Amino acid sequence: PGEPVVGTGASLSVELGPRLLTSIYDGIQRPLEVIREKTGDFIARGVTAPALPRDKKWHFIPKAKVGDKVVGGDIIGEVPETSIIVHKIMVPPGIEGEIVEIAEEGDYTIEEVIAKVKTPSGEIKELKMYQRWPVRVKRPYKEKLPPEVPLITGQRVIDTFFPQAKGGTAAIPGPAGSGKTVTQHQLAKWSDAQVVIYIGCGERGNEMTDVLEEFPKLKDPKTGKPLMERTVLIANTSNMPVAAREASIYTGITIAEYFRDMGYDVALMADSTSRWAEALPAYLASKLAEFYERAGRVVTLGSDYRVGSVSVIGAVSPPGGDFSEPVVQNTLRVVKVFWALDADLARRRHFPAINWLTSYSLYVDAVKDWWHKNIDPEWKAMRDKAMALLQKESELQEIVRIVGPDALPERERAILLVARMLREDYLQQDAFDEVDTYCPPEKQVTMMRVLLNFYDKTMEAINRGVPLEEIAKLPVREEIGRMKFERDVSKIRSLIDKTNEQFEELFKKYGA
Structure with missing residues (x-):
């Protein structure tokens, strides 16, 4: 006004x-x-x-009746607004008392009074759909x-x-x-x-x-x-x-x-x-x-x-x-x-x-228990581990810029291999792809387990004399690079066993 x-x-x-x-x-x-x-x-x-x-006429459905006690925010009706959203008709804040009058299910315009509330004073408040x-x-x-x-x-x-x-x-x-x-x-x-x-x-x-x-x-x-x-x-x-x-x-x-x-x-x-x-x-x-x-x-x-x-x-x-x-x-x-x-x-x-x-x-600790309870008990341990790998990768890339890559030990080369897989297979994501446009929580933790299990097998294998070039050419590495396009999380999950098995064949091949 x-x-x-x-x-x-x-x-x-x-x-x-x-x-x-x-x-x-x-x-x-x-x-x-x-x-x-x-x-x-x-x-x-x-x-x-x-x-x-x-x-415009709105379809009003009552959700309360005469004699009901109400406070502000109480839902007294529903209106299907769009094909997606149901509009909930609420008592305005600051209004309380008894419903003495409520509209029946029917079609109404928004200046129509769909209910009346008698406050404790006895004052009569008229409620609309807005x-x-x-x-x-x-x-x-x-x-x-x-x-x-x-x-x-x-x-x-x-x-x-x-x-x-x-x-x-x-x-x-x-x-x-x-x-x-x-x-x-x-x-x-x-x-x-x-x-x-x-x-x-x-x-x-x-x-x-x-x-x-x-x-x-x-x-x-x-x-x-x-x-x-x-x-x-x-x-x-x-x-x-x-x-x-x-x-x-x-x-x-x-x-x-x-x-x-x-x-x-x-x-x-x-x-x-x-x-x-x-x-x-x-x-x-x-x-x-x-x-x-x-x-x-x-x-x-x-x-x-x-x-x-x-x-x-x-x-x-x-x-x-x-x-x-x-x-x-x-x-x-x-x-x-x-x-x-x-x-x-x-x-x-x-x-x-x-x-x-x-x-x-600043919400990592605030949300972790939800992830732990509903999705995967290792969510926070796994994010922290992946982040530490990224943090390490960044320090190494700076050192390498200055002194070159030729005298990197296998352990450090392995860190770089796996960080690279983290960046390409997990951080990178394709908004335009019909599967990878959205990654459900259960898929996120499963891809992460696949990647972190590969990391652990990589370091175990380094530790046992397997050369890093062999780990890099492992067939499973390249299915891991495609996990993100897979809609079926159980096929992604099976990469863990598939990884363990290919590493076993590398152990047999080196007597490692």
Whole structure:
């Protein structure tokens, strides 16, 4: 509306209800292009359009009845919104009491009052299929849970060495381009979040166009349905007001929090480094912080025990291609994970071009018990071992650069052989391949066991006089290089026995 009050200005809010999905907005949730506003401490002014259509009929299913006691977050109905997502109709935060009136199953437009609640006062509150929330106010919840369950991306280098927790905070520094774009796209479509809130575009120039024309064609690989049906986009464009681009990340995170309150895992993804806007280094630092602080996995409001999360992934691309700060350095300081895309790795044709020495995740210990309990009790021991091999490989390659390869002992040559297999057979991954576009957790640990078992057999064999050239030509080495294209994890698993057997024949052949 247009009401003015002391403190934060015209309370800038979003409409939360059905039809949000598949929608594209600007920084303050207008369907249109353009935008208009004056961001300050004091206030902000804006008029035009409706965020949610009032014309569309929604199929309402009641999930409560007259006489039920309710609190904020209680689910009182369901609406099938898209062919992917069921919209859960919740009591707005701050409302409690008895349901004295609830709609029957029928078709309704969003201004229709689908229930009434009598509060303890006796005051009668009318509930609709949508609700409103100030974007600068974090939606409430019962409890923020410590990081614990991984957001599974299906990308080996991430899930294994640099994991993201559901509710966690990630950034992707490094050069913009196909690399970043492909990784962004793999994350959005493969991560086990049900809903994606995507902020950006505006970064390229032809980008708004490609979004307008290609994004409706993209499929959700999980369902074969349009990805648009689990997505909401917020566009920050060069023509749009400074004020609104400022606000877009609050709009974004409020909409994400609303889907978490229903019990979904949501991924909030940002790719709007350049277009982010400033009216008037501590200003940037505080705004980054207030945003990232809102990520989290929570026990939601409601009378049933229920958990949802917002995981934040922010692409950070230097404004003028400038390696240095500020945007880059503060954001890396706030997030708990980053995936450093690296142009030299791209030129070595190592894809995805995630530098496994400069990336880091502070969630390894937080997610390990989940991996241990659900997938493989050796997950953490194996990641640590593979990383130590990579760390060793890097020190050796530096030494070798200076003194040459000709006086390397067999043990050191073997380390290099196996590190190379780790980099090519495991870290490298093919987003374009119909099998290797996603790697299930059970496949990740099984490929890793195959590789680490090969390493152990390699060092045992070195130890017993087998020459390294023989290990390098072992037929099984080359099936290991193809494990990633195999859909059937038991065929991958059998490489362990196959490896043991070929090494045995090498032992018989040397009397070793």
